[PDB]
Structures are given as C-alpha cells and as structure tokens.
Amino acid sequence: PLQLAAKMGKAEILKYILSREIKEKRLRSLSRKFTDWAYGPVSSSLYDLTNVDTTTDNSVLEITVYNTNIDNRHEMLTLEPLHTLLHMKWKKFAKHMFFLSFCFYFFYNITLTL
Amino acid sequence: RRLKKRIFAAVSEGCVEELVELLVELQELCRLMHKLTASDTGATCLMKALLNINPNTKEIVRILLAFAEENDILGRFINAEYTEEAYEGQTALNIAIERRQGDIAALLIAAGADVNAHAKGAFFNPKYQHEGFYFGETPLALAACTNQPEIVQLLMEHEQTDITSRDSRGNNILHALVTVAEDFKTQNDFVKRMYDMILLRSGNWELETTRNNDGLTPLQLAAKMGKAEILKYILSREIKEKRLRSLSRKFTDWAYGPVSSSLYDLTNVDTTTDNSVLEITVYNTNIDNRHEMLTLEPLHTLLHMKWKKFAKHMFFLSFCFYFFYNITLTLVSYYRPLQLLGRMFVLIWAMCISVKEGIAIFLLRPSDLQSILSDAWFHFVFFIQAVLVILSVFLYLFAYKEYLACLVLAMALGWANMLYYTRGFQSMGMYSVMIQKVILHDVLKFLFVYIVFLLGFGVALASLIESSYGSFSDAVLELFKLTIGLGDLNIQQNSKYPILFLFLLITYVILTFVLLLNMLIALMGETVENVSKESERIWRLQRARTILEFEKMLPEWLRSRFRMGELCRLCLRINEVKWTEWKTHVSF
Amino acid sequence: MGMYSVMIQKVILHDVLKFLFVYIVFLLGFGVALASLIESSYGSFSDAVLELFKLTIGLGDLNIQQNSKYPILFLFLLITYVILTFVLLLNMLIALMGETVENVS
Amino acid sequence: IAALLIAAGADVNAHAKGAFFNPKYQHEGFYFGETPLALAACTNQPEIVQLLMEHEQTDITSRDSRGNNILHALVTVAEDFKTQNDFVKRMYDMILLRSGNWELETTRNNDGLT
Numbered sequence: 001p002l003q004l005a006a007k008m009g010k011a012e013i014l015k016y017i018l019s020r021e022i023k024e025k026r027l028r029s030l031s032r033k034f035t036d037w038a039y040g041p042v043s044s045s046l047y048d049l050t051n052v053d054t055t056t057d058n059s060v061l062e063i064t065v066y067n068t069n070i071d072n073r074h075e076m077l078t079l080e081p082l083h084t085l086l087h088m089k090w091k092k093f094a095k096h097m098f099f100l101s102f103c104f105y106f107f108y109n110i111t112l113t114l
Numbered sequence: 115r116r117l118k119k120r121i122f123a124a125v126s127e128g129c130v131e132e133l134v135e136l137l138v139e140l141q142e143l144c145r146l147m148h149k150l151t152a153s154d155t156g157a158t159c160l161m162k163a164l165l166n167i168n169p170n171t172k173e174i175v176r177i178l179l180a181f182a183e184e185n186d187i188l189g190r191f192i193n194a195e196y197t198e199e200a201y202e203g204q205t206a207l208n209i210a211i212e213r214r215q216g217d218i219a220a221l222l223i224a225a226g227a228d229v230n231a232h233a234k235g236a237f238f239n240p241k242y243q244h245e246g247f248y249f250g251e252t253p254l255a256l257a258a259c260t261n262q263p264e265i266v267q268l269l270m271e272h273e274q275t276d277i278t279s280r281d282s283r284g285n286n287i288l289h290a291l292v293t294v295a296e297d298f299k300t301q302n303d304f305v306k307r308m309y310d311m312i313l314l315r316s317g318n319w320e321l322e323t324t325r326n327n328d329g330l331t332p333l334q335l336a337a338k339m340g341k342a343e344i345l346k347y348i349l350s351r352e353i354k355e356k357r358l359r360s361l362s363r364k365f366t367d368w369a370y371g372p373v374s375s376s377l378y379d380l381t382n383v384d385t386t387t388d389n390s391v392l393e394i395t396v397y398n399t400n401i402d403n404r405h406e407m408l409t410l411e412p413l414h415t416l417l418h419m420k421w422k423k424f425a426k427h428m429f430f431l432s433f434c435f436y437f438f439y440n441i442t443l444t445l446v447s448y449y450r451p452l453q454l455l456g457r458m459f460v461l462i463w464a465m466c467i468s469v470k471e472g473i474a475i476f477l478l479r480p481s482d483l484q485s486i487l488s489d490a491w492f493h494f495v496f497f498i499q500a501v502l503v504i505l506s507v508f509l510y511l512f513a514y515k516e517y518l519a520c521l522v523l524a525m526a527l528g529w530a531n532m533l534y535y536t537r538g539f540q541s542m543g544m545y546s547v548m549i550q551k552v553i554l555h556d557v558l559k560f561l562f563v564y565i566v567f568l569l570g571f572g573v574a575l576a577s578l579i580e581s582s583y584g585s586f587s588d589a590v591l592e593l594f595k596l597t598i599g600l601g602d603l604n605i606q607q608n609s610k611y612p613i614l615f616l617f618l619l620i621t622y623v624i625l626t627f628v629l630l631l632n633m634l635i636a637l638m639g640e641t642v643e644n645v646s647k648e649s650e651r652i653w654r655l656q657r658a659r660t661i662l663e664f665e666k667m668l669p670e671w672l673r674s675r676f677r678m679g680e681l682c683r684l685c686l687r688i689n690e691v692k693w694t695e696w697k698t699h700v701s702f
Numbered sequence: 703m704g705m706y707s708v709m710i711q712k713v714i715l716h717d718v719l720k721f722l723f724v725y726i727v728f729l730l731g732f733g734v735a736l737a738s739l740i741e742s743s744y745g746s747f748s749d750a751v752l753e754l755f756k757l758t759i760g761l762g763d764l765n766i767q768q769n770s771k772y773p774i775l776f777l778f779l780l781i782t783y784v785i786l787t788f789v790l791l792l793n794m795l796i797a798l799m800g801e802t803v804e805n806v807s
Numbered sequence: 808i809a810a811l812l813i814a815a816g817a818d819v820n821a822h823a824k825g826a827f828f829n830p831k832y833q834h835e836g837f838y839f840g841e842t843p844l845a846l847a848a849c850t851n852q853p854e855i856v857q858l859l860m861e862h863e864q865t866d867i868t869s870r871d872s873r874g875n876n877i878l879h880a881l882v883t884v885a886e887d888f889k890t891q892n893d894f895v896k897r898m899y900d901m902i903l904l905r906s907g908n909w910e911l912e913t914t915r916n917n918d919g920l921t
Contacts, residue, residue, distance in 0.1 A: 037165075039212065040235075040247040040260070113573055371837040371850070373827075411903050448738050448747075519772050522739045526779065529731030533724075545720055548794070559789055591766065598784060599760045634789070639797035646801065700851050701892040 002051055006063040009070035014060075015079050018052065047081040061085065118149050123158050128168040130177070132209045137181050146185050156197030163210040163611060164218065175218055179225060192227050196235065196407055203233030203251065211256050223268065229275045234282045250290030251281035258287055258312065259294045261304045270315055277316055283334075284326025292336045295344050297403055306347050308362075329389070333382055337394040340401035345391075346410050349383065365685075372696035377685040378412040384664060384684065386677070392416065395691055396658045399479070399486050405651035408658060415688050417658055424668070425661045425675055426538075433535045439463045440528045443503065450488060460509055468500035473602075477482055489659055492534045499527040524576060537660065543653035544646070551645040560634040564626070568593055571622045578615065581608045597626050705807070712806040713799055721795040725787070729754055732783045739776065742769045758787050809855055819843060819865045834885030841871035848877055849884045851894045858891045860905055867889065867906055874916025877902060 005013045022031040037052040052060045064076045077083065117140060126132040140149065150159050157165075163174050182188035196204045207227035210219040223229065233251045238247030249259040255274065257266040280286055285293065288309065295305040313321065322332055336344045363379040387559040395407045406625070408414065417585040420495055442456045474493050483490050506520035533549070536542035568590060576589035580624045582604065583589040596619075609615040679686050729751060737750035743765065744750040756762040759781075770776040813819065823841045830836030831903065839849040844865065847856040859865055870876055878899065885895040903911065915921060 040249075042247050115799070168751070185723055257780070369758075371839075373837050444734055448734060450738065515771075519775050522735050522779075525738070526731060526735040526782075529734070531729065532727060542720070545724070548798075549790075552794060553790065557785075594781075595764050598757075598764070598788060600757070600762065600764050635793045635796055638793055639800055642794065642797040643801055646798075671848075693833075697886060697890070701890070701894055 002060055003058060003063055006060045007067065009067065009072045009076065010076075011072045011075040011079075013081065014064075014076055018047075035097075045080075049085075051079065052081060052108060053085065116527070117143065121149070121159060121161055122152065125163045125174060125178070126166045128170045128174055130170060133174055133177055137177065141181075141184075144185075146187055147190060150191070152192065153197075155201070156195070157193045158191055158206070160191065160206040161204070161209055164213060164215070167213055167215060171215075172218060175221070179221075190228060190462065191229075192222075192571055194223065195231070195233075197269070199235075201233070201235040203231065203235050203238070204507065205231050205233070205253075207231070207253055208233055208256065211253050211262065211265060212260065214260070214262065216262070220268060221406055223272065229269065229272060230279060232281060239283055248283075248290075248293065250285060250286070250287060251283070252279060252290075253594055255280075255281070255287050255290045258291055258308060260631045261308070263308065266308070266312070270312075277326065278320060280324070280326065284328070286321060286326075286332075288321050288332040289326060289335055292332050292341060292344055293339065295336075297339075297341050297343075303343060306343060309347075313361065314353075314358065317361070319361070331382060333391055333395055334389060337407065338398065339390045340398065340407065342403045342406040342410075345395075345407055349378075349391075349413075350411060352546050367687075368675060372691045372693045373689065373690050374691075375687060376411075376681075376689055377682060380412065380416075380679055380684045380686050383412060384416065384677075384679065385662065386684075393662060396662050399482050399488050404655055408654065410668050411593070411684075411690070412686055413690060416686070419663060419678065420665060421657075421661050421677075424672075428664045428667075429535075429538055429660065433464075433538070436535065437532070440525075440532070443521075443528060444525050447525055451519070457507075460503065464500045464507070467496060468504060471497035489556070489656065491550075492531075495527060495531060497627040499531060500522055502527065511589055523610045536655050537653065540650075540653060543656065544649045547649050547652045547656075548642065548646065552641055553626050555641045556634060556637045560637075564630065567622070567625060567630075568597075571618065574618060575615065578610055579607060580607070582612050583607050583609075593622065596623070629654075708807065709803065713802055716802045717795060717798045721791065721798075725791065728783070728786060728791075729758075735779060736776065740768060741770055741771050742767070744768050745771075754783065758782070768769065809906055810858060813862065819859065819862060820869060821870070822871060828873075834838075838873075838880075838883065839872070840875060840877060842869060842877070842880075845880045848881055848898060851898070853898065853901070856898070863876065865901050868910060868914065870914070870916065872908070874918070876911060876914055876916075878911050879916060 002014070002017050005017065017032070019033050020031050021033050021035065022028050029036075034046045036044040036046060038044075041094070049055075054062055061082055064073060064082070065071075067073060070076075120136050121140065124136050139555075140146070144213075151157070152162075160175065163171060163178060168174075179188065182191055190204070196202050205228060207219065207222045207229070209229070210222055224688075231253065237246045238251055239248055247463070249256040254266065254269050254277075257269060270277075278286065281290075283289075291309050291312075295309075296303075325331060326335075330338065333345070333348050336348065338484055348363070350364050352360050352364050352366065355360050359365075366378045367375040367377060369375075373460070380386075385393055392413055392654075395404060395413070400405060401407075408417070439460065443460050446453060446456045446460060471493055475497065478490065479494070483487075502520050502524040506517045506524060507516035509515075509520060533546055536546055570587055571591040572593055575583050575593070576586045582592055583625055592601065596603065605612065605616055607615060665673075730790055733747055733754055735752040736744050736749045736754070740750075743753055753762065757764065764780070766773065768776060812839055821843065827836045832855075838857055839846040844856065844859050844867075847859060858865075868876065871880075881895055881899050881902075885899075886893075912921060
C-alpha cells in the first residue's frame with residue numbers, strides 16, 4: 001500500500017503512513033516513527049526504512065523520484081524520512097561523484113578541442 | 115543491577131502497587147544513591163518519572179519523595195544533576211517546569227528544589243539556534259520562555275530566588291526573552307506581555323542596564339537581533355502608575371486631539387556612547403527588518419534631525435569637491451602634450467581619497483560585508499580609482515609609458531563613479547539600487563552563458579576554415595560583431611563545408627539573438643518589478659548609513675555643539691500628529 | 703487614443719528622462735576616455751561621441767584598428783561600454799517602461 | 808463636567824483664536840472651528856452638541872477667524888476616504904436639520920466659498 005500510494009502520488013496518505021505514531025499498548029509495533037526524547041522544539045525520532053530506503057528492488061524513494069505521471073512529486077519529496085535521506089545520500093558521496101564527473105568531462109572537452 | 119532496572123521500569127510504567135512493592139524490597143535490602151542513580155546519563159528516579167509522566171505520575175512522585183524523606187536523602191537527590199557532557203545541569207525542577215506540570219513543579223519547589231540551579235549543558239547553549247534549545251540556563255528563564263505565568267509568578271514570589279542572575283552566556287531573564295521573541299508580528303505575542311510583567315515586578319533599572327559578555331543591554335541585544343516589536347515596546351513605553359513612572363522612557367506632556375507632545379529618552383539610542391541602538395540598527399548586516407526598526411520613534415525623527423542639521427551640507431560639499439576633482443582630472447589628461455596647479459590638486463585629492471578609503475576598508479567588517487550590498491563596492495572602486503591616479507602620476511614622473519593607460523582608466527572609473535552621488539534625491543536612489551540589483555542578479559549569468567556559447571562556436575568555426583574567420587580571435591570578434599548588429603553576414607568565407615558553416619552560423623544566431631537577449635530582457639523585467647517593490651527601504655538604509663558616516667567623521671568639538679537634547683537623562687521633545695489614529699479612536 | 707497620449711506623457715516624464723541622463727553621463731565619460739588615448743576615427747571628442755552613438759544605435763562598423771597606443775585597452779573599453787549600454791541600459795529601460803505602462807494604464 | 812460648566816454660566820460663544828489652533832498646515836496643528844460648538848461637532852459628541860444647540864444663549868451663524876462656520880469646519884475635518892464609520896456626514900445632516908435654514912449653506916468665508 002505504501003508503494004502504491006507513492007506511485008499514484010497521494011501526498012497526504014504517504015505522509016500519514018511514513019510518519020505514524022501510536023501510543024497504545026500492544027499497538028506500537030504498527031507505528032513507523034518513535035519519539036525518543038522531546039525538549040521544546042528539539043525532537044529526536046527513529047523512523048523506519050523497510051521499503052523507503054533504496055535497498056530492495058523497488059523502493060518508495062525510487063518510485064517517487066522516477067515517477068513521470070505525477071504532479072505532487074515536490075510535495076511527496078519534502079517530507080521525512082525522504083528529505084533527510086536525500087541530503088545524507090548527497091553529502092555522503094554524490095557531491096564528490098558529481099565534481100569528479102565535472103572535472104573528467106571538462107578535461108575531455110578541452111582535450112578534444114585542443 | 116536487577117533492582118535498579120526494576121525500579122526504573124516501575125517508575126516509567128507508573129504502577130503504584132509495583133512501585134510500592136519494589137520500594138519495600140529496596141528498604142528490606144538496605145536494612146541508596148548508587149541504586150537510584152543511573153550512569154547512562156547521570157539521571158535519577160525522579161527525573162525518569164518526570165520525563166515519562168503518566169496519568170498516575172503524581173502518585174509515583176509522591177511515593178518517591180516519601181521514600182527519599184524516610185531514607186533522609188531527599189536533599190541529596192534535590193541537587194542531583196546530569197553528569198553527561200550534553201545536557202549537564204538538568205534537574206527534576208527543570209524537567210517539571212519544561213513538562214508544564216505545575217502541581218509537581220510547585221511541590222518540588224516547596225520540597226527544597228534548587229531554584230538558582232544553572233543548566234550549562236553544551237546542547238543548551240548551542241552555537242546555532244537550530245542546533246539546540248536555549249532558554250536561559252535557569253528555571254525562571256525556562257518558565258519565562260515557555261509561557262507559564264503561574265509558575266513564573268510562583269518563582270518570583272519565592273524568597274530564595276534571584277533576578278540579577280547571569281547565566282554562562284551572561285544573559286539574564288530579559289536577554290533570554292529578547293532572544294526567544296519572534297521578529298514577525300504574530301497574532302498572539304506572549305513574550306512582550308510577560309516581559310512587561312517581569313519588568314514591573316522587578317521595579318528597578320538594574321535589569322535593563324546589565325551587560326553580558328557581549329557588552330549589550332537588552333535594548334541593544336534586541337536591536338542587534340532584529341526584533342521590531344520588542345524594540346518598539348522598549349523604546350516607547352509609558353507607565354501611569356505611581357513610583358513606577360521612572361521605568362518609562364516616554365512621557366506625554368500635553369495631548370489635544372491628534373496633536374501630542376512626548377519626551378523620549380536617548381540614553382542608549384543617541385550616537386553618544388561607543389555602541390548605540392541607532393548605530394547597531396543602521397550598521398547591521400545580518401537582519402531583514404531594518405526598515406521596520408528604523409521607521410519608529412525616536413529613530414525616524416532623530417535621523418531626519420541629524421540629516422537636516424549638517425548631513426545635507428556635508429553631502430553637497432562632497433559632491434561639489436568630487437565633481438571639481440573629476441573635471442580637473444579630465445581636463446588635465448585630455449590637454450596632454452594652470453596645468454601645474456590642477457595636477458597638484460589632483461594629486462592631493464587622490465592621496466586623501468586613497469588614505470581615507472584605506473582606513474575605511476581597514477575599519478570595515480571583513481565578514482559578509484562584500485557578500486551583501488553594504489556600500490562596499492563603492493569604497494573598493496573609489497580606492498581603485500585613487501590608486502590608478504597616483505600610479506599614473508608616479509609613472510609620468512618616471513619614463514614609463516603606461517601612465518596614459520592608467521589615466522584613461524582613471525577618468526573612465528571616476529566618471530562612472532558619479533552615480534554614487536545620486537542617492538541624495540529619492541528619484542535616483544531607486545535607479546541606483548536598480549542598477550545594483552539587476553547587475554548582481556541577471557547580467558552576470560547572461561554574460562557567463564554568453565562567453566560559454568561564444569567561445570564554443572568560435573573554436574567550432576575557426577577550425578573548419580581552410581577568410582575573415584581565420585584565427586580564434588578573429589572568429590570571436592566576428593561573432594561578437596554579428597551579435598551586436600554590425601558588419602555583414604558573408605556566407606563565402608573560404609570554408610571547406612559552406613553548408614555546415616552556414617548551419618553553425620544560423621544556429622548561433624538563433625541561440626543568441628532570438629533566445630538569449632529576449633530571455634535576459636524578460637528576466638531583468640521580473641527582477642526589476644520584484645526589487646522595485648522593495649527599493650524605498652534600501653534607499654532609506656543607504657541614506658541612514660551616509661548620515662551616520664558623516665556624523666562619525668565630525669571632529670570632537672563639532673559633535674558636542676550638534677548634540678541636541680533637553681535634560682530632564684537626555685530627553686528629546688517630539689510633536690506627533692496622527693489624524694487617522696485620532697479619527698479611528700474617536701469614531702467609536 | 704487619449705490613453706495613448708497619456709501613455710506618451712507618463713512614460714516620457716517617468717523613465718525616458720532618467721535613462722537619457724544616465725546615457726549622456728556614461729557616453730561623455732567613455733568618449734573623453736577614448737579620445738585621449740588615440741595618437742583614426744576617434745580623433746576628437748565630438749568624433750568619439752558620434753562613433754559611440756552610432757555603435758549604440760546599431761550602425762557603422764566596429765573597427766578595432768583605430769591607431770591607438772593600447773589596442774587591447776581600447777578594445778576592453780569599447781566592450782565595457784557595449785555591455786553597459788546595449789546589454790544593460792536598453793533592456794532595463796524596456797523593463798522600467800513596461801512596469802510604468804502597466805501601472806498608469 | 809461640560810454640562811455643569813454650561814449651567815454655571817460658561818462662555819458658549821467664546822472664540823479660541825490661538826495661532827496653534829489655526830495653523831497654516833493641517834499637520835502643524837489641530838483646527839476644529841475656534842468654537843465649543845465646532846469642537847463638539849468635530850470630536851463626535853452628539854449629546855454635547857445637542858445640549859449646546861438646545862441652549863438659548865448660543866448662536867449658529869457665528870463665523871470664526873477663518874470665517875468658517877460649523878458646516879465649513881465639518882467639511883474641513885471630514886475624511887475623503889470612504890471609511891467604514893462616517894460620523895461627520897450624519898452629524899452634518901443632524902445639524903442642518905436642526906438649523907432648518909438656508910443661511911448656513913449660503914454663508915461665505917473670507918475665501919468666498921459656500
């Protein structure tokens with residue numbers, strides 16, 4: 001159901017499923033977000049990345065990024081745990097890979113021109 | 115270690131019977147600090163119960179307090195604090211105040227909880243505002259920032275507490291409230307009302323005169339952080355109660371309909387001391403509500419008075435002097451082989467401008483000054499022009515031949531520099547900020563894409579020619595001439611592939627003339643509208659900066675003579691008429 | 703046509719005057735800059751300002767060989783003038799006059 | 808207190824010709840008409856203006872230093888913008904109806920204007 005919501009482009013249902021908190025006993029297992037400690041505006045939360053991370057063959061992040069028949073892609077991408085995951089994946093290796101590709105292509109073009 | 119785990123589990127769950135049985139077992143084993151304190155974060159059973167409060171948390175807290183009293187260790191546990199390096203200084207009273215549990219908070223205060231406890235954890239005073247929560251490292255400051263009137267009143271009524279306490283940052287309750295306050299005018303503003311309440315309950319000038327390690331009063335701190343609402347409230351404060359009128363900074367003398375005369379206070383507002391509110395709000399570069407803060411008394415009237423006193427005359431004198439200097443330089447250089455005197459005047463003024471710009475650059479802030487449009491480009495260009503003039507003179511004194519190039523660059527820069535003097539009139543300050551914003555926004559990107567495409571097509575064209583497109587420089591010159599609209603499009607250029615050459619030329623024409631130029635027109639139109647909606651504020655800020663610079667440039671004796679203010683403290687009398695406000699008040 | 707007449711009046715009184723003033727400022731500055739380093743066409747100040755005006759309006763030819771002492775400096779000054787006037791000032795005047803046209807229409 | 812003073816014999820036709828009262832600029836002072844009746848009219852006091860009108864020792868055709876009467880003063884004080892609450896028009900109507908004569912609307916000041 002989560003992947004289907006991501007594919008069809010339902011931001012509200014996607015956000016509800018991704019960030020779901022249950023405070024009842026014996027039902028907390030159904031939740032995907034657990035609040036560890038809260039102090040005013042600061043809040044630490046453990047999210048679940050079963051079908052959200054790009055680990056399996058098909059993932060929610062890959063579906064919402066590679067979707068071409070949707071219009072709420074920005075709305076779906078600007079919510080946890082997708083925004084933080086994207087920034088982490090960027091700052092880990094994507095910036096370095098992009099800079100390396102830039103340098104390699106620039107040197108290749110300069111060599112061809114010369 | 116099982117007993118401590120059982121105690122913690124019972125405290126977290128809230129089972130009264132289980133907690134009582136565990137306490138009985140602990141008492142039997144004893145017949146306690148090591149078993150009650152956890153080394154994970156240096157917490158305690160009371161802290162664990164308050165962090166995980168439940169519908170029966172009051173009973174658990176009462177049972178724990180009774181057990182501590184029976185063991186005669188309650189006073190030992192009241193002063194318990196976190197031993198970790200992240201949230202050091204936390205206490206049960208602090209947690210109870212944060213969790214808005216007023217009954218338990220009052221119970222802890224009555225039981226002897228530390229009121230003046232300082233929570234100096236690293237997470238509490240983070241370097242960035244988004245990296246942590248800062249409240250003041252004090253239960254009183256936390257109650258003030260968390261909007262608990264009952265709890266803050268109960269703390270204030272206590273005898274063991276203090277008000278003049280300064281935390282690690284040096285900030286007191288008023289500084290903490292100023293920092294926590296929101297610049298935007300929200301519908302519900304509790305910080306201002308509770309600041310008023312705390313100041314009235316204190317009833318002394320020590321709170322508003324104390325300086326932290328940054329050497330700022332609460333008013334100066336509000337001006338620096340950019341809180342228009344708090345700044346206006348502090349600047350225009352009226353108290354009608356007896357023995358409390360001294361705390362006010364604005365006194366209404368007489369009122370007759372819309373006309374009202376008011377004496378304001380200029381202790382830290384006038385540019386008299388080393389640091390002043392006006393100087394802070396004018397020279398601030400990391401704020402966005404500068405126009406909102408500057409458009410309120412006693413800053414607007416003070417700025418207009420300081421202008422009309424001497425700043426207009428100084429600006430006109432500078433305009434005339436610079437215009438005559440530029441005219442003399444232009445005439446002297448153009449009439450190249452009365453001349454000696456003109457050259458001497460040019461040299462003297464160039465040296466003066468160079469040294470003044472050097473002092474200005476040295477005294478200017480080296481951070482974020484060049485990134486923002488804080489009148490740094492004009493200083494840089496003036497210094498560069500003076501350096502060019504003096505270098506041209508030195509080279510003419512010698513036998514070198516670059517003096518002519520330096521001099522022509524000097525006249526070009528100086529004649530392009532007259533626009534700086536168009537900020538005196540409102541009709542042209544908008545034009546100057548238009549130039550600045552458009553150039554900084556769109557022209558740079560358009561130009562960059564232009565050289566990219568131009569160089570690409572130039573090396574493409576110059577390589578397949580076995581006439582005019584001989585070398586790379588000739589090809590790029592011809593492309594530029596075709597773009598700007600001169601020359602002729604000759605298809606017979608002795609090319610190996612005439613059809614390919616024509617195709618490349620037509621592609622370049624479509625890319626540049628059809629797309630790029632009209633695109634730049636559209637982008638610059640959008641930018642013009644956007645920053646013409648917000649140009650008056652920028653012009654006013656530039657005028658205020660010029661006024662303050664001229665005021666600082668004045669000598670010692672002239673500053674004392676121009677110091678305007680009637681003693682009562684240095685009060686300033688302002689007559690204000692608000693016809694719209696008077697009509698709205700009287701129509702009720 | 704009354705709307706057209708008031709359009710003429712408002713646009714001329716608002717934007718054309720300021721654009722023109724900045725134009726003569728930059729034009730005279732660059733003219734005296736160019737006419738002083740020539741030891742061909744840019745002989746005197748009047749000839750230099752006429753050539754600059756012709757280059758701005760879009761006639762003539764951009765001849766880089768003007769018998770100048772510093773050809774690179776002359777070319778740099780000419781390109782700077784072209785960027786300042788053609789790229790920036792004219793399209794800026796277009797944008798400002800568009801905003802004024804909407805506002806007073 | 809105003810009614811008490813009127814009943815005690817306070818001057819009703821007293822003219823307040825102070826320089827601040829008739830300033831050259833509208834923002835340099837408060838202009839109401841240099842008359843207690845004109846001030847009551849401009850300050851939106853229906854009860855006080857009615858009590859003054861019902862008095863016998865008062866007059867309506869009085870002209871101040873500017874030559875303006877109550878109607879001219881109300882016109883000057885009135886706001887061009889159509890505000891939500893417009894009291895000047897209603898009280899102008901009330902005063903004109905209570906006067907019941909064409910002398911008020913035909914008198915000209917030193918500027919020669921009705």
